[PDB]
Design a binder for this molecule. Structure first.
Ligand code: HEM
Ligand SMILES: Oc1ccc(Nc2cc(-c3ccc(O)cc3)n[nH]2)cc1
Length: 393
């Protein structure tokens, strides 16, 4: 028999019980990736946190030529260090202030968009597709408002993502075509005088500010492309698979409908058990570092399995159960940890909270319209998503 291969399953509605047996017997284990490279798979909360909290496990260095690779680069190699380049241009504070849910009228725009999408579904009649006709259009509309771009440009940018976020063994020619086209669009936004709000509106005025005169134009447009794609694919995928977990639990669904003030705690447990990230977080060791029973050598690839940490019984007792009263509710790794902690976590939380709350009010009796096995799980992709999520209510 051959070396164990990752990823285990494209399914995002159950964790394979091989994860628990691996975490107990071998919390750091040698695996093979889709490119044929070997990597260290880390599946325990203690070791995942160690790897994420140690910058000698470098994300930037995963882009080096000849390194062992989890998948093929779908971006220019310098875009792998996206947040490092943003921080070096002095734009980190401005970017993060622009993508908070605390902007005036942002939460109200979400609820109106969520209610409008659910009303169209109700009017068309069951069955409805909650991913393509709810969760994804909501994520797309939210990021258009956050970036400051017209809502009508959302759909054409969204359809690049099924290729842009592939997990491929080989480079993808269409990924570069979509990237170049989406960069040109974002560069025109920076030259568009009608774009004065959101992230692109702020970046536009900073581009003309003397303190940013020697920041490259490619970087301003890269921020727009990279934050739209990362945000749309992460919020849309998380909300899609969180709705499945809710629907599968009619008692939890009724409780959140009856007492909607528990929705923030519900979303935190849905984040912890979430399987949206299809691969471990890749890091390349830049030194010899002891991890558990393994001396990781310089130049080797490390994969941080988030569901291994988030389903760890040593840190979350009874990990498969949704418990709205845990003592450590936000200590999960759904947003990462350390240097590269997700910069849009607050906006991702409010997107799911508002989407769920609107769904429970409009379709309180929402349930699957097909047996759970009939869902089609997207393969070789950086997220686990069903192609369609058909429901009745
Ligand atoms: C439910 C929603 C989301 C989830 C579960 C999520 C998850 C994550 C995780 C786990 C990481 C860490 C990656 C690593 O350490 O290798 C990350 C990073 C990142 N996220 Fe999110 N994310 C979400 C929403 C968003 C949103 C709304 C945005 C922007 C609008 C965004 C933009 C980014 C960016 C740019 C990074 C790279 C950070 C860096 O390299 O320092 N994400 N995300
Ligand atoms: O129209 C589009 C939209 C997305 C992409 N693909 C793509 C990769 C990333 C990314 C984000 C963050 C990061 O740290 C590293 C890569 N964003 N978008 C291409 C064309």
């Amino acid at each position: 028999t051959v070396l164990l291969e990752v990823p285990f399953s494209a399914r995002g509605d159950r964790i394979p019980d091989a994860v628990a047996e691996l975490r107990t017997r071998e919390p750091i284990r040698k695996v093979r990736t889709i490119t044929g490279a070997e990597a260290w798979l880390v599946s325990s909360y203690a070791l995942c946190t160690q790897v994420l909290e140690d910058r000698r496990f470098s994300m930037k260095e995963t882009a080096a030529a000849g390194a062992p690779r989890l998948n093929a680069l779908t971006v220019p190699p310098e875009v792998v260090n996206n947040m490092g380049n943003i921080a070096d241009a002095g734009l980190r504070k401005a970017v993060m202030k622009a993508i908070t849910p605390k902007a005036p009228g942002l939460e109200q725009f979400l609820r109106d968009t969520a209610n409008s999408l659910l009303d169209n579904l109700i009017t068309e009649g069951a069955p409805a597709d909650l991913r393509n006709d709810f969760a994804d259009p909501l994520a797309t509309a939210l990021h258009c408002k956050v970036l400051g771009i017209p809502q009508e440009d959302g759909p054409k940018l969204f359809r690049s993502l099924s290729i842009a976020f592939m997990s491929s063994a080989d480079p993808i020619p269409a990924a570069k075509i979509n990237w170049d086209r989406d960069i040109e669009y974002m560069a025109g936004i920076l030259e568009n005088p009608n774009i004065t709000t959101g992230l692109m509106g702020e970046l536009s005025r900073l581009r003309k500010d003397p303190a940013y005169s020697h920041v490259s134009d490619e970087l301003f447009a890269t921020i727009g492309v990279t934050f739209f794609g990362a945000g749309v694919i992460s919020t849309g995928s998380f909300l899609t698979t969180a709705l499945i977990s809710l629907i599968q639990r009619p008692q939890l669904r009724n409780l959140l409908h009856e007492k909607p003030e528990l929705i923030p705690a519900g979303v935190e447990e849905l984040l912890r058990i979430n399987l949206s990230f299809a691969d471990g977080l890749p890091r390349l060791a830049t030194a010899d570092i002891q991890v558990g029973d393994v001396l990781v050598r310089k130049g080797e690839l490390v994969l941080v399995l988030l569901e291994g940490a988030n389903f760890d019984p040593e840190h979350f007792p009874n990990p498969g159960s949704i418990e709205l009263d845990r003592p450590n509710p936000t200590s999960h790794l759904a947003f990462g940890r350390g240097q590269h902690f997700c910069p849009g976590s607050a906006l991702g939380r409010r997107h799911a909270q508002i989407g769920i709350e609107a769904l429970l009010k409009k379709m309180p009796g929402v349930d699957l319209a097909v047996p759970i096995d009939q869902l089609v799980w997207r393969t070789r992709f950086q997220r686990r998503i069903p192609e369609r999520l058909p429901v009745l209510w």
